[PDB]
Design an enzyme around this catalytic site. Structure first.
Site, PDB file in Angstrom:
ATOM      1  N   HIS A 153       0.826  -1.151   0.064  1.00 15.83           N
ATOM      2  CA  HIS A 153      -0.080   0.029  -0.193  1.00 15.83           C
ATOM      3  C   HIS A 153       0.629   1.508   0.307  1.00 15.83           C
ATOM      4  O   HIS A 153       1.151   2.323   0.987  1.00 15.83           O
ATOM      5  CB  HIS A 153      -0.939  -0.136   1.158  1.00 15.83           C
ATOM      6  CG  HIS A 153      -2.124  -0.839   1.093  1.00 15.83           C
ATOM      7  ND1 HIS A 153      -2.442  -2.734   1.501  1.00 15.83           N
ATOM      8  CD2 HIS A 153      -2.836  -1.343  -0.206  1.00 15.83           C
ATOM      9  CE1 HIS A 153      -3.037  -2.911   1.361  1.00 15.83           C
ATOM     10  NE2 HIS A 153      -3.709  -2.165   0.554  1.00 15.83           N
ATOM     11  N   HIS A 197       1.401   1.253  -5.622  1.00 23.48           N
ATOM     12  CA  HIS A 197      -0.120   0.841  -6.114  1.00 23.48           C
ATOM     13  C   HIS A 197      -0.760   1.796  -6.166  1.00 23.48           C
ATOM     14  O   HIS A 197      -2.025   1.677  -7.436  1.00 23.48           O
ATOM     15  CB  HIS A 197      -0.407   0.112  -4.278  1.00 23.48           C
ATOM     16  CG  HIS A 197      -2.071  -0.125  -3.947  1.00 23.48           C
ATOM     17  ND1 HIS A 197      -2.794  -0.967  -5.317  1.00 23.48           N
ATOM     18  CD2 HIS A 197      -3.135   0.113  -3.342  1.00 23.48           C
ATOM     19  CE1 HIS A 197      -3.983  -1.067  -5.219  1.00 23.48           C
ATOM     20  NE2 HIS A 197      -3.767  -0.433  -4.354  1.00 23.48           N
ATOM     21  N   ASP A 232      -5.527   4.832  -0.867  1.00 21.22           N
ATOM     22  CA  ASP A 232      -4.899   4.824  -0.347  1.00 21.22           C
ATOM     23  C   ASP A 232      -3.938   5.305   0.341  1.00 21.22           C
ATOM     24  O   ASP A 232      -3.094   5.250   0.727  1.00 21.22           O
ATOM     25  CB  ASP A 232      -4.578   2.795  -0.448  1.00 21.22           C
ATOM     26  CG  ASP A 232      -5.073   1.778  -0.683  1.00 21.22           C
ATOM     27  OD1 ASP A 232      -6.008   1.763  -0.028  1.00 21.22           O
ATOM     28  OD2 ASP A 232      -5.026   0.961  -1.210  1.00 21.22           O
TER      29      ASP A 232
HETATM   30  O1  ROF Z   1      -6.910  -7.933  -0.553  1.00 22.09           O
HETATM   31  C1  ROF Z   1      -6.147  -6.982  -1.290  1.00 22.09           C
HETATM   32  N1  ROF Z   1      -6.261  -5.926  -1.472  1.00 22.09           N
HETATM   33  C2  ROF Z   1      -7.078  -4.882  -0.997  1.00 22.09           C
HETATM   34  C3  ROF Z   1      -8.189  -4.242  -1.267  1.00 22.09           C
HETATM   35 CL1  ROF Z   1      -8.329  -4.052  -2.977  1.00 22.09          CL
HETATM   36  C4  ROF Z   1      -9.224  -3.013  -0.532  1.00 22.09           C
HETATM   37  N2  ROF Z   1      -8.759  -3.652   0.182  1.00 22.09           N
HETATM   38  C5  ROF Z   1      -7.979  -3.574   1.449  1.00 22.09           C
HETATM   39  C6  ROF Z   1      -6.966  -4.798   0.587  1.00 22.09           C
HETATM   40 CL2  ROF Z   1      -5.654  -5.527   0.906  1.00 22.09          CL
HETATM   41  C7  ROF Z   1      -4.971  -7.821  -2.285  1.00 22.09           C
HETATM   42  C8  ROF Z   1      -4.360  -7.139  -2.693  1.00 22.09           C
HETATM   43  C9  ROF Z   1      -3.342  -8.129  -3.807  1.00 22.09           C
HETATM   44  C10 ROF Z   1      -3.214  -9.754  -3.224  1.00 22.09           C
HETATM   45  O2  ROF Z   1      -2.493 -10.073  -4.454  1.00 22.09           O
HETATM   46  C11 ROF Z   1      -2.115  -9.815  -4.910  1.00 22.09           C
HETATM   47  F1  ROF Z   1      -3.098  -9.940  -6.408  1.00 22.09           F
HETATM   48  F2  ROF Z   1      -0.766  -9.524  -5.189  1.00 22.09           F
HETATM   49  C12 ROF Z   1      -3.788 -10.012  -2.416  1.00 22.09           C
HETATM   50  O3  ROF Z   1      -4.318 -12.003  -2.257  1.00 22.09           O
HETATM   51  C13 ROF Z   1      -5.074 -11.796  -1.692  1.00 22.09           C
HETATM   52  C14 ROF Z   1      -4.258 -13.389  -0.952  1.00 22.09           C
HETATM   53  C15 ROF Z   1      -3.294 -13.728   0.141  1.00 22.09           C
HETATM   54  C16 ROF Z   1      -5.106 -14.147   0.760  1.00 22.09           C
HETATM   55  C17 ROF Z   1      -4.898  -9.359  -1.441  1.00 22.09           C
HETATM   56 MG    MG Z   2      -8.011   0.648   0.557  1.00 23.55          MG
HETATM   57 ZN    ZN Z   3      -5.874  -0.314  -3.078  1.00 26.79          ZN
END
Ligand code: ROF
Ligand code: MG
Ligand code: ZN
Length: 326
Positions: free
Chosen positions: A75, A79, A116
């Protein structure tokens, strides 16, 4: 210099899914958010349309970018830059051609840029469980998302940072509301409700003879913008594998660090945050099966067949990750 030349060449792919965002971060001296936003604003003629002085835009963007933490693995400003650029590509989907006004485009891109900002690298649940100042301030609901908005908007008040100074009062009020509505919708706790409404819209969808979406009221327009930025947030597994793997490495590093803080505080370690008991590959396949694919398949139906290549890449990547599991 050669560095500036190679950076300009990479930025020529700003309209393409799979832009080399990590290379851009390197080439720009860790300024991916500033250079990508500037490029997109120039590409969409947003400076002229909203009479945004160039110096003001850059001053705001560098300040915003400075408020993303460089020591947070996922984050961070990279990103943010990626969600911005992904949203920009989604806004150009032929099925949404001329659907959104310049103001709505501005809101969706700005929302993506700030969505974020000032992320501490820990989840809402962590903040609630540790009796944090943020959770106390926001009464446990969309704690981080509320904070991102507050910071993103507050930074506009810094010296020469008001990129919206030349919008009318009505335009400023509308943009503020849309941005808040979009960022609050990035909270994963709202994912299931967003998807259900997306599916409802897909089933009752109205289009022109060319397949362009007809969205009249605010409720439907903001729902599509919400789901668009949500898709961008959840776009990592739909990118070329080389990029996706880097995103996975980063999210796991961030999650493991939270788990390390939880372990030393005596707290129960959150799902996928335990570096000593992780199944990175299985978790990615589960993530795709239960969250990412259902969402993107629904988005694909809404803009059919414009998102086919994105869906194809997602399925390719799921197949690859599954193959790494014995
Ligand atoms: O949750 C996510 N992002 C997120 C969002 Cl979209 C909104 N709010 C909080 C988070 Cl952490 C997020 C983003 C990327 C991930 O992996 C890869 F694509 F890089 C991932 O893996 C999950 C997994 C291991 C169980 C999870
Ligand atoms: Mg977020
Ligand atoms: Zn995000």
């Amino acid at each position: 210099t050669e560095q500036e030349d190679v950076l300009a060449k990479e930025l020529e792919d700003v309209n393409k899914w799979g832009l080399h965002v990590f290379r851009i971060a390197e080439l720009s001296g860790n300024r991916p958010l500033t250079v990508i936003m500037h490029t997109i604003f120039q590409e969409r003629d947003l400076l002229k349309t909203f009479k945004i002085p160039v110096d003001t835009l850059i001053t705001y963007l560098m300040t915003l970018e400075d408020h993303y933490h460089a020591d947070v693995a996922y984050h961070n400003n990279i990103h943010a830059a990626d969600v911005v650029q992904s949203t920009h590509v989604l806004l150009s989907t032929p099925a949404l051609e001329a659907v959104f006004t310049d103001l709505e485009i501005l809101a969706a891109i700005f929302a993506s840029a700030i969505h974020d900002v000032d992320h501490p690298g820990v989840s809402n649940q962590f903040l609630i469980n540790t009796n944090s100042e943020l959770a106390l301030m926001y009464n446990d609901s969309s704690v981080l998302e509320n904070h991102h908005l507050a910071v993103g908007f507050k930074l506009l008040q810094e010296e020469n940072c008001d990129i919206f100074q030349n919008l009318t009062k009505k335009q400023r009020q509308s943009l503020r509301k849309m941005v808040i509505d979009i960022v609050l919708a990035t909270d994963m706790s709202k994912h299931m409700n967003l998807l259900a409404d997306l599916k409802t819209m897909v089933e009752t969808k109205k289009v022109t003879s060319s397949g362009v979406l007809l969205l009249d009221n605010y409720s439907d327009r903001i729902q599509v913008l919400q789901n668009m930025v949500h898709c961008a947030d959840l776009s990592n597994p739909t990118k070329p594998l080389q990029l996706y793997r880097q995103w996975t490495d980063r999210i796991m590093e961030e999650f493991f660090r939270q788990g390390d803080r939880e372990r030393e505080r005596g707290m129960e370690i959150s799902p996928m945050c335990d570096k000593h008991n992780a199944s990175v590959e299985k978790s990615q396949v589960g993530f795709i099966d239960y969250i990412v694919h259902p969402l993107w398949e629904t988005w694909a139906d809404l803009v059919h067949p414009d998102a086919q290549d994105i869906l194809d890449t997602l399925e390719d990547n799921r197949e690859w990750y599954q193959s790494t599991i014995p």
